[PDB]
Amino acid sequence: IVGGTASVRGEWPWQVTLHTTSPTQRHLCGGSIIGNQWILTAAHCFYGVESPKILRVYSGILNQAEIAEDTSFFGVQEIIIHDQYKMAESGYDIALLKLETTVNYADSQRPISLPSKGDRNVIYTDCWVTGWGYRKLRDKIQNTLQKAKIPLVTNEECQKRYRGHKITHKMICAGYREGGKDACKGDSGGPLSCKHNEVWHLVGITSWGEGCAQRERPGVYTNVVEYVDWILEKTQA
Ligand SMILES: *[C@@](O)(c1nccs1)[C@H](CCCNC(=N)N)NC(=O)[C@@H](NC(N)=O)C(C)C
């Protein structure tokens, strides 16, 4: 997260940190708890990942320093990538992690509500991006979970900033015209939570962008509301 600040512990209880044990344990991507055995994250996060056996999901984390060899984690039973996904910049950048065990909800770890198809008219004005990603282009994974409030931008506006791409209605963008605040490397798969009517909604999933926090270059997110049916199909055994 560029231009953000340190989060308060338990502020974003749906936020989880995806870790890879190969070669040595490390932060891979972000993710969101959406059900007791389900993490919603980005498909492109699993590039090169041949098996879920090398994955560990940590919930209720503020500082990466909380994570050691003796820290409890959730194993991943299955990675579910959208069948139409080919590359973040192409859309369909969404995936589910089915956990080997169930998450015991608590003040530090609970699920975020998915947006409803009815809410596609809602004008979210209170939206935040969070993660342990880079604070700058050439940085490193951050110890403390960061947060930044970022305004949504219309798809038409976003398309203007990415004339080499196709910003579909399955994408959603957010950023300041002048830049300064944005997600960055390592935040991928993280949630774009927007507080509407005293209720947090998972509006987007951090996906890609040209650089980080650059002016006239808003971050691009998966438009979650467009995948509610897909999520329900893959989440139902
Ligand atoms: C993700 O955190 C990661 N993806 C793979 C490893 S870390 C990056 C988030 C970038 C967010 N940028 C922004 N809001 N401006 N995602 C990426 O780096 C993707 N590429 C780009 N060019 O963003 C990924 C497809 C390589």
From Swiss-Prot:
The active site is at H44, D93, S188. Disulfide bonds join C29-C45, C127-C194, C158-C173, C184-C212. Changing G31V: In FA11D; mutant is not secreted by transfected fibroblasts; dominant-negative effect. Residues 1-236 form the Peptidase S1 domain. Heparin binds at K160, R161, Y162, R163. Glycans are attached at N63, N104. This is Coagulation factor XIa light chain. The lineage of its organism: Eukaryota, Metazoa, Chordata, Craniata, Vertebrata.
